[PDB]
Amino acid sequence: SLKDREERRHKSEFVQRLLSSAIFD
Amino acid sequence: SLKDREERRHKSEFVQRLLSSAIFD
Amino acid sequence: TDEQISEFKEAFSLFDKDGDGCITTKELGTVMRSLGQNPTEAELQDMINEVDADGNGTIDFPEFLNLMAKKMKAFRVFDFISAAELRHVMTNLDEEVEEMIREAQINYEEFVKIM
Amino acid sequence: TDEQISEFKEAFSLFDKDGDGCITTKELGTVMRSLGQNPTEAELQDMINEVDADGNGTIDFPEFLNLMAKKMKAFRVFDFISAAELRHVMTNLDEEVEEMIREAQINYEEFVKIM
Amino acid sequence: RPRNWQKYCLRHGDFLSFLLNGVFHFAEESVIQTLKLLNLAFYVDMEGVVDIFSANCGDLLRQFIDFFLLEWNSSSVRTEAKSVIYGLWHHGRHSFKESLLAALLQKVRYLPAYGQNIVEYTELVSLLLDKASKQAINELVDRCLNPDVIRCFFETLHSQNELIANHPNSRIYSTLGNLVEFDGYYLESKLESLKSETKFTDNRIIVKCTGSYTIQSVTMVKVLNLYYNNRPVSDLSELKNNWSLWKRAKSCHLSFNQTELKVEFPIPITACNFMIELDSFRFEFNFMAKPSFIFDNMENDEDMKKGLAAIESESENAHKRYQQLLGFKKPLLKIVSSIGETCKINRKIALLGVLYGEKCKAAFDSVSKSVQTLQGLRRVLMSYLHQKNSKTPNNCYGCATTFVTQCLEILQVLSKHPRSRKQLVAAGILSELFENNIHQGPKTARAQARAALSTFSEGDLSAVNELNNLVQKKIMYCLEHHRSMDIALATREEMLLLSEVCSLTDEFWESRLRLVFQLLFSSIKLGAKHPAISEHIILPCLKIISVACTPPKPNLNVSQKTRDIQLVSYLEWEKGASYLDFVRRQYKASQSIRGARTHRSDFLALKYTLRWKRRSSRSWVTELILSACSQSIRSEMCTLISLLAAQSSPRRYRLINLLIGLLPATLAAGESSAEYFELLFKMIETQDALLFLTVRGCLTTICKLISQEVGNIESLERSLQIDISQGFTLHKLLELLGKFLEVPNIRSRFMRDNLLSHVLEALIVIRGLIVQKTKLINDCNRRLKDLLDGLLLESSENKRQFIRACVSGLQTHAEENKGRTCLFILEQLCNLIC
Amino acid sequence: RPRNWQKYCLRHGDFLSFLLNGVFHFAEESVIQTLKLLNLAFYVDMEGVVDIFSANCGDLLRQFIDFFLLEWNSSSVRTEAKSVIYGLWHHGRHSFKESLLAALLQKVRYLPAYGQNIVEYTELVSLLLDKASKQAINELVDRCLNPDVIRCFFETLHSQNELIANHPNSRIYSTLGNLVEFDGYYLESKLESLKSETKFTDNRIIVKCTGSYTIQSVTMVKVLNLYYNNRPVSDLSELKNNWSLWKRAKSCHLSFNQTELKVEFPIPITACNFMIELDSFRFEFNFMAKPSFIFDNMENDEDMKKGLAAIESESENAHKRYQQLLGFKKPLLKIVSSIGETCKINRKIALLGVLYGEKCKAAFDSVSKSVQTLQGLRRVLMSYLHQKNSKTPNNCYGCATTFVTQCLEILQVLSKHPRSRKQLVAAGILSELFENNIHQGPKTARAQARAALSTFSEGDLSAVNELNNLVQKKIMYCLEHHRSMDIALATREEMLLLSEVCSLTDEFWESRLRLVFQLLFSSIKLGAKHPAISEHIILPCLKIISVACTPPKPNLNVSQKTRDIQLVSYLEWEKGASYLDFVRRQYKASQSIRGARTHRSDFLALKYTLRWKRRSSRSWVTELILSACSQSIRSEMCTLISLLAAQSSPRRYRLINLLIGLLPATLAAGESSAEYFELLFKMIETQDALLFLTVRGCLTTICKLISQEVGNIESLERSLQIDISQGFTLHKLLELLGKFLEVPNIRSRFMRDNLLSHVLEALIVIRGLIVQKTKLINDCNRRLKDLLDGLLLESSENKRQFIRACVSGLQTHAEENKGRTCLFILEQLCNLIC
């Protein structure tokens, strides 16, 4: 569903931000 | 020496008492 | 400073491909980032519509000094800032709070030293 | 008790090999141990010299009742017994002391129940 | 025609009760015909016909179940009984459905004693208990199932797993399996081949076999008569003259000169002695049959006397064979214990192979043959004794293993039931599975066990907590003591388990991500330079994280602006920050930006509160991106860096700055920096990126790095060590410099800054090299002279500045009396002037 | 005559300085003669002669050390230099002793670069630093030694161990070593055989070899002339016609018809081309020599041109050979990773053997040959270059391993020095040794490392604490997860280490005993029924404890009475009670008993205070004494029980009571109770013990146990399982009963208590057995009838009581319509009456 796809977008973006923080902190 | 032999007697008796206590406690 | 304007001219000339003293409105973000600043794309568009009033798509050197000049250029919302005040500004949006204040009551000077 | 003397006679007869009603002075420790008691060898020799006055090396049944009779048959050295009193009777020979008293001040009755 | 048979059964229900009563006493073939008729009867509603089995308060049904689905040693009859029971379940009344499935589950306690025969029963049970007008049937299933059944399931599973684990031969089996052709557990505590004695006459052949054999057909004269008997006999003389002891099996008529005759018996004949007569007018007689221990039912006391004598003789034979088996077991145990201590082979496993596959197999087969003979004679003996006077658990490794393997699929079925799931996790099924089943058993068993564990952990809390606790503890230990054991063997199964559990899309992905991060950082901290740790722990963690970060392939201004706001940091996340906090912060920021006085104040407050949370909460990229041990890790972080930079331009620029900061470290990496340099080249493909680095003074950095590398190579000139890959890092530095010089304004800044002195000095030094002169060095020298003429061709001012640089170099090198360098620069000046 | 040479050196000291100056430039044979002369010079006091080496502020001595004890690649010359230095140390002045040993220790930082050549140097250093008029020499040794030397020792040891541990091929080497014939680490990053071209003439044979060879002698006509040259040549034509390029080595004169001629060269000749001429009047020429890379010192620039061409060609050849080595490395890595996954052999190790021992060896040898050729040509090239214009650490696994192995004996030597011991333990040498050295390296290295660790731990506190901490942690972990890895392989070295450290007779035996007790109890608690744990952890703990308890083989009333007093219990000892407390309590008790008002009160106080301490502080015998897994553990605790009972009679009686209490458990043990029953029989050998048990009602216990066992066997009668060892426990119960009955009064009590009913009933039941009728059962039946007639023969009252028992049995069995039992008892009554 569109809601599920958007939720996967948010999850991928959240884990991407986690990686960027773990690299640049 | 006699003192050393007596000390080994006491050590063996002490560890024997340890075993008997560990068995019968 | 004189060294500052000198280095800004040095960076400006490199983007000045054809030597007319003007750079394209696309390249402003790149030149401004090359000088140590990190403006967001929304700020970039704010610049582009404020300076490019005539819509020629070019920005000359005297204007190029102006955009960054304002670019390199808060206590009162949490207000001294106590633990309780920080707790309300928190809830609006205890041991950890104590750790916060201890590492930082927090006046203006400690507040500055810790930003 | 009547059952007690009956079982003592039952045990005595087994050591009575030749049926004369007397057992050897060597076997007193074995027969006395077979009945549940555990006297030390020093106690065994105390018995042997107290009962075997004539030195015949034999003990008859009526005497055999006597040795164990006294055999199946302390508060004042540590004296209620407080923590401090137990500490002096200890040093003569704190948390652990507290554990001691807690598991056991200790009157005669608790003292008995814990021996 | 199933329907006509069904109406006939309906109008004659008394016939099916007769068949059901008799089938317990029929022989196997008539048993098959009876069960086929029963199956066709329940192919029309048979509602009234089902109640036949419930006679005698269900005793008849239980006898059917026990005799048929478990006891009978034939796969086909068990499958057919399962089909019959399924038809009973489908056509039965609701009360009869409860009664029949109650008859089914009553055999749980007797299941382990029946070996592999329980497969059909368990498939039937799984199909019946599966939840699919059907609401009432599920109600019967729920009413009949009771917690006692699950408790017995768990208890027998635990008992069998304990038996396997505590087995004295478990270590021997585990070691022998990886070394030798392992196809068994033997350490558990034609006419000619069948004949033993043969006599002949003018037209008859009397044959005594080595034992009892059930023959279904005989394939090989005008009339041919076959006779048989299963009476054990000492010699053929007593049967030669007594014709009354021979039973006529079949009479066959042959055509003239018929060379082949196939004689099939409608009912198999069991015979220890057979007699073939050519009644009327080279022979090869070949029989298809099995060894049989169903001996003739003895009729007199002399026969029981002979049977008892056979008991004694076969017991002595079995004792001798068991003694030889033990005597061969001892050296096998000896060699196994020596494994791990040093024909192109290790001869120890050669001895193990001979002992285990040839002699131990033969000894165990002889022991088993004596054993089966003993059961045959004993069974017939007690049969006669009972006629005259009127399953214990085993320690078999294979039987326990197969029961465990099937019970894993049973648990996988039961795990979808919630009540059973809670009961089993409370009983501790997850710990049992993790400790024993995921490490032991065949591959199919391991997969089924992992799937069952995953299904049990789905939708239940603190199960994931305990699972991550065990995984973290054991893997972290293996990390701490990695130098003393096999990290690859110790942590392969658990790494796989963590990989599969992370793929689950329940709500508890966050905890698994936490565990992955902790494992990755711990492995980097302790064993970053260790090969096995990097290949077996760091790489799977990076792969899992990359899979999490990849978006599955299918207002914008607000979304971009919220991306500029750092919502959650890693330090906050490790301490307990949640994804729900992330989405809440993102939503509040998006609302404040959309409203962007109140929404502006909320935006500013959120900005600083999160910044101050980060401050309050307040190298691995270098270690792994240039890890000389593995190219896979370098490639993986190159992919991760590309994925991160592909989303945000400012983050891309920070990544470019970080990568450029790592340039000096590539001098030591040498060939290891191929992936990093390729990533850099992909990253700076834009001219804007090149100019961005030029503003940051990266051109001067490149120049001094080239000078440092050429000085380092010049220092290695006095050393005789020859490294073939010499100058690869210098080659890539030159390539990056050439990429920078392609832009006109960058070249103008290059010439203005008077950095041409560095390239000329490097040209001098590398042209002066002799010992360190490899192919890469020659290619670098070529590229230097190429840059030189390329610069010289552009303009006269560049030529004048190069002349000035040559003059200064001549001064400094002549003050250093360096004749060859002066010669080189004089040659260069001569070449430019003329 | 050493003495005359010594006086000649004394009167001509300027001669020895000349020899010392020249020896740096002499060739190896004259070097040997010079060092022999020097050794004989220092065979008389040479006090004034030693000061020759200290010329030029010790530069000459350091040059001697560097060139001789380290650089020269000959074991004999290094040993002779070591002897020379030892003579210098013995005959030298004190200041010269300091200077010479300072020259020695200055090469510590350069030691690792020299490979196996450091052996002689390190033996010399160990002999010199060893503490042995000698007080001043020890003073010089102490003054010269500085903490920096030990710090460098520790640092290089740590660096090499890190290199070994972090090596990418460490796992490959460890796996390949236990599978294949492992004799190297190749994964680190006659005339005909010597000839390559040959030409002949009427009387001359010109031979070009495949390379440079240093020939010491040639063994194979009236006059035979030999010529040689080491000039590299493309073809033999250029040497055929130019005689000036040939150097005459030796001229040999032959007798008539001489078939053998051995030509020895006083100085070896290095030649790439040799020419043999039969000057005046089938030939097989065989040469003893080595391949040499000392090529002729080139004299012109054409030769350096050819040398550079040879550099390029050999570099290309080496690159090709390294490429083939890598291409064969890849499949080797492939097969190694598959080890552990399932000709009588595993073919994987066959492929590994072929790859590793045959093709990888050949490829590595070819690579190395190209390498040594390259060093030869490069060395001669830079030699010519230096003439015209006027050791780095390696990652070799073998070199690092051998250096580590030698450094372990170095640490074993340094450990006897207290200051160095404290410095090294502070640096963390014990943890380093325990983590890496005790698990890795050859057996000699492991033994040396364990000895060095033991010597370091001797006489120092908290070292034993940390050692026991590591041992306890790792072994306890291996205990917890024993089902998932090899307990035997994981804990063998540490179990051995605990065994050796416990044998030390320092003051810290008490802590090691504590650790042994904790390990034993934990292993019993977790894995008592597990085979590997019992065999590899429980058994060594029991052995260590037994060794501690055994007294080494060489007032009495007071000693016996103090033995009656329990001084220290295990619960108190585990909590921190010490042996000093034990001896203090024993001494106080002995004094109080010797004085035995005050001493009586002290005795009573000690008694109750210790009793109350025990109360305040307030099964494994059963588990291990009848452990069906291992007979060794049962035998060990039987020995321990005997040792304990052999000292005290009351303790012996308590042990007898405990053993008799374990009698019912022997029913399940079966054959496992052999050791326990033998111990019991040894324990009750005295008639007093038998009567003691009789008083306790043990006869009735034996009777009811026999009844229970015969009932259990009778229940197994309906089961078809046949166990050969059936009735062994019943056999031993019968044997114990027969031992009891040997005493007359015991038999009288037996008859009086009317226990004869039990034996008659057992006789009936076992005579009625059929299925369970084994040899042990028949023997038991025999012994029953034996007891029966033995009782019957004694007296008539016994016959009357047996008749009464038969009458009661007839009543109870006739009410049970048991025909066969009634028949048996009727037969017994008939036999007694008639």
Residue numbers in the entry:
A (entry chain C), B (entry chain D): 180 to 204
C (entry chain E), D (entry chain F): 6 to 78, 89 to 94, 100 to 113, 119 to 129, 136 to 146
E (entry chain A), F (entry chain B): 3091 to 3133, 3183 to 3271, 3276 to 3332, 3349 to 3379, 3390 to 3450, 3514 to 3574, 3596 to 3643, 3656 to 3819, ...
Quote what the paper states about this structure:
Among the >600 human ubiquitin ligases, UBR4 plays a particularly important PQC role, being an essential and conserved E3/E4 ligase found across eukaryotes. Aside from teaming up with various ubiquitin ligases, UBR4 activity is linked to two specific cofactors: calcium-binding protein calmodulin (CALM1) and KCMF1 (13, 16, 17, 20, 21). Our data show that the evolutionarily conserved UBR4 complex forms a megadalton E4 arena, in which inward-facing ZZ-DZB domains of KCMF1 act not as E3 ligases but as substrate receptors.
We turned to Arabidopsis thaliana UBR4 (also known as BIG), which diverged from metazoan UBR4 early in eukaryotic evolution and has distinct roles in hormone signaling. Drought-induced protein 19 (DI19) emerged as the best candidate: it shows strong homology to HsKCMF1 in the C-terminal pin region, has related biological functions to AtUBR4 (37, 40) and was one of the top hits alongside AtUBR4 in an N-degron proximity labelling screen. Co-expression of AtUBR4, AtDI19 and AtCALM1 followed by cryo-EM analysis on the resulting complex yielded a medium resolution map of the dimerization interface, which we could model using AlphaFold3. The resulting structure confirmed a highly similar arrangement to the human complex. Despite this structural similarity, one notable difference is that the DI19 co-factor lacks the ZZ domain. Instead, an internal ZZ domain is found in AtUBR4 itself.
